[PDB]
Amino acid sequence: GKYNLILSEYLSFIYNSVQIPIYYSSNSELENRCIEFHSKCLENSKNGLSLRKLFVEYNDVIENATLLSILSYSYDKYNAVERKLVKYAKGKPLEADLTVNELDYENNKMTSELFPTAEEYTDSLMDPAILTSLSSNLNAVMFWLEKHENDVAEKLKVYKRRLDLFTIVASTINKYGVPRHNAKYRYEYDVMKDKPYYLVTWANSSIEMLMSVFSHDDYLIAKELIVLSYSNRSTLAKLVSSPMSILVALVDINGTFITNEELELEFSNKYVRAIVPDQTFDELNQMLDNMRKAGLVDIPKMIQDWLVDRSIEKFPLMAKIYSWSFHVGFRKQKMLDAALDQEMYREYTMLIRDEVVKMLEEPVKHDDHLLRDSELAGLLSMSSASNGESRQLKFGRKTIFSTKKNMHVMDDMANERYTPGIIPPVNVDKPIPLGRRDVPGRRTRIIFILPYEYFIAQHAVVEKMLIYAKHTREYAEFYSQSNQLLSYGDVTRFLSNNTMVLYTDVSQWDSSQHNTQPFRKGIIMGLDILANMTNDAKVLQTLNLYKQTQINLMDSYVQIPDGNVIKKIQYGAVASGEKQTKAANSIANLALIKTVLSRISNKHSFATKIIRVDGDDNYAVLQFNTEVTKQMIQDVSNDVRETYARMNAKVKALVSTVGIEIAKRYIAGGKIFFRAGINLLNNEKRGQSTQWDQAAILYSNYIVNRLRGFETDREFILTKIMQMTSVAITGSLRLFPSERVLTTNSTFKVFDSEDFIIEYGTTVDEVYIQRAFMSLSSQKSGIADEIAASSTFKNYVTRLSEQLLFSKNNIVSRGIALTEKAKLNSYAPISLEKRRAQISALLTMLQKPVTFKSSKITINDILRDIKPFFTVSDAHLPIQYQKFMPTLPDNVQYIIQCIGSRTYQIEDDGSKSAISRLISKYSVYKPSIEELYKVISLHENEIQLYLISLGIPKIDADTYVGSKIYSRDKYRILESYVYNLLSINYGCYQLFDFNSPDLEKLIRIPFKGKIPAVTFILHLYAKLEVINYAIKNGSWISLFCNYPKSEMIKLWKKMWNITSLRSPYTNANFFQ
């Protein structure tokens, strides 16, 4: 409820020249009052008359109606930012030390000194790539400063620390003025030329950090980072983060959580003595010395202080610094510099070849259907296919330019130019265009943008590969529905005073030319063995074509931009951009550690408890037949590094007995930690999302950081959302959506009125508003239709269908057409028409609704029914689980202490149902949870046709439609679909154990009717209600269900007619 009020203070703060609160009500008479009040308000304003009496005269509308939005008319130039900033510019501007960076352009020189002409200029190295302005961020920060001006006690100190810091930004920015942005939120050469190139991006990173400062430690860290970042744009994050890799090895283990035979977390009071060889301390000191040499003082001191005792109790600071380092910004170099960095592998290539065969040995011999119809699968998959180059297309009677692979396939199929049998060359004749990957602290990487022939030639095989990984534990990232908690648990498991954990960073090795030969050689060698396992023409061809993509890649060439010219150098390293990138890289990293561990054994005798490959890291737990000593650790560590060295692998390999550190997570003191370094006011690249989507993404990012240990003041986040979600009617009229519009569960939801708690319309006004937004959920797109009617498109839909279906499929066919129609929204013209349509509708929608014949049922409606049948009563749950994830906020951590947490993902796609498995056994088609949901709920006779229409044998189709499993699936599909609509796998909930015995007690549900569907939703609704209460109140409640038996049948019917909601909030979770 505080959002609507904060919004007014902000608008009053920004404009000082009128505000017109717009209300609405499900009630008819009240709504007329709302209409009258709005009119009188506009009339008084357009006469310079007070609205004070009017607010009293319409107290009823203020008190009972729902605020829809706040109208704002201001006749100013918005140049107020220039004026407001001077009050804080009373400081000494920062002076960029143009000596800290290797590459000259990474130094905060003057924009002109890097681009003496407007024709050579490019924001490609500092572009915030976000749909919000630096001008806005400044306004937001000053607004908060004013509000917390008279604060007292500790709140004042927070204000004090922030006021200081903002002065640095204000002083430095004032020296050159505030960079004015254009409509596309892009900063041009005219504004930028007379100012430091990295000025704008730096301001965003600094503003973002300072509005996240609370404690004195935050201030110290933010101050050092904000100041050094101004000149260091390439090693600050790496320098600050390097120590953590060693620190984890230091903290002793006093009680930790492990994984048991049921793959679930379980507390163990075990104690493990961290044993660190003297040499490790030197390595740590060097990292510290380097930090000091780079101008860092406070941060190095803090680590140094921590090093006296190395207590897990005072470790939060080390973690806080580690997360903070990323908020400096991304390292955006020049394509060329990024690209430029680029007998013993006998064992290594052998393992890769063998691993390749195992993953496909069974599918190939049996003559798996997918492998046979692989090419068809690739076409269906094209949607989830990585982007390609911007080609010249022609649909129907028009010409366009698309970068989507599916569109290239349509045009190519039409003009008889579609030839998947022929896998284009990627050498000097056909140079690979290049995509990039920008991350904080690490060097920029390139991405191959190969033609679709490559994806199709690879999709089926990789999917089969991943399946093997799914049931293989070595592949931490893929194994089961497992989350990182299980991986965390596996390491702690065996840790004892006679075992040492060996972690290794291998990110550099993936792009090592030394690596590329053994790599492709191993995959192909394996492919040949696979071919010698079958005779199937379909299988051998798909198996063979994959072999071809590897050979073309063996010698690839790249189009590296160098100014306004596109050079072409011979690339000889394994870059990413393939379909097998993630899976193949995993196979290689695993092969690598297997190879290294095998070599070291010749000297030391250990036991391989576990071996793991997870992303850009790999690790293992070895057990020795004697207590581990510093000397033993030193010997194993040296031999490991030496072995990696012999293979010419630039990798960072450490050894410990208590912790580990890898890109996705780090374990220190038995506890689990996840870096909270997601940048907020600066993005990696520019996409095609809207400001609203971006606002929801920002909130989403804010939530993940907060859960991980970095908290940006919510008031600031709220203000940004206020700026980003606003809309302009005229040049002086800007409309700001209210809290209800923004937080309600609709197609326009941006955030939760209360963090970690998702609410659902529990009032008539909310339901009234919810239905209205849905009406204009999907808008028209003339262009999108032109192509839908285009022959080249129709043939495409029909061609795919005529290869999948045997009999008469329309349920599947209707889906394929609509799927494609949507698969075109990326193409700017189509999406752009949609946003404009959505906005105009939204502008009027905010004004007047009423005419909407509701008939669609959503999750909101089902819950709306159940609520009235639950009797609440205070209950009590004692804290019994020790905190294993320290950074978690208190309210969220409290739930875990009482009910615990999980280590798995809840099936929410329906893949675990028999029907889905059966369709997979015979068809390459992949029905969604939504389609399966509609299909399972059809008449037994229809299900038989649908299964057969997809190639399913009649004996099998008939056997299932009756079997007990078919009915069982019915519950599972609905259960899977519902979990999906409840975001049970995202946000905060994904952490909680919804089957906690402790939570289960608080739910008192008498089974008046043994109807699996109704019993399920009532229990889940009860669990969510109880948990949300704990999250917001710190205490518990017990829920008793007295749902009518007669009513249950009505409800059960409603359950099978639920419409899924699409929104920025929804997209934001998926975005993660």
XYZ file of C-alpha atoms in Angstrom, residues 108 142 165 171 218 323 343 364 408 468 493 594 606 691 722 767 777 798 841 851 872 891 935 947 1039 1061 1065:
27
model
C 38.296 6.740 -18.935
C 18.084 12.962 -4.964
C 28.965 9.005 -1.916
C 30.600 16.508 -8.376
C 28.867 -1.069 2.767
C 29.255 -9.949 -4.445
C 50.437 -36.822 -27.675
C 21.481 -45.856 -31.945
C 15.406 -18.379 -43.045
C 22.181 -39.399 -20.418
C 29.055 -35.397 2.411
C 39.316 -37.592 -15.217
C 43.634 -41.799 -2.925
C 10.302 -0.600 -20.389
C 7.572 4.515 -11.277
C -11.256 -9.206 -9.958
C -3.803 -9.261 -23.336
C 1.727 -27.915 -43.718
C -5.387 0.234 -25.388
C -17.825 -3.746 -21.104
C -7.590 -19.536 10.636
C 11.882 -13.436 7.072
C -5.785 -33.236 -24.111
C -2.333 -40.481 -29.932
C -5.698 -23.773 8.594
C -1.676 -15.520 -17.512
C 6.412 -10.461 -13.977
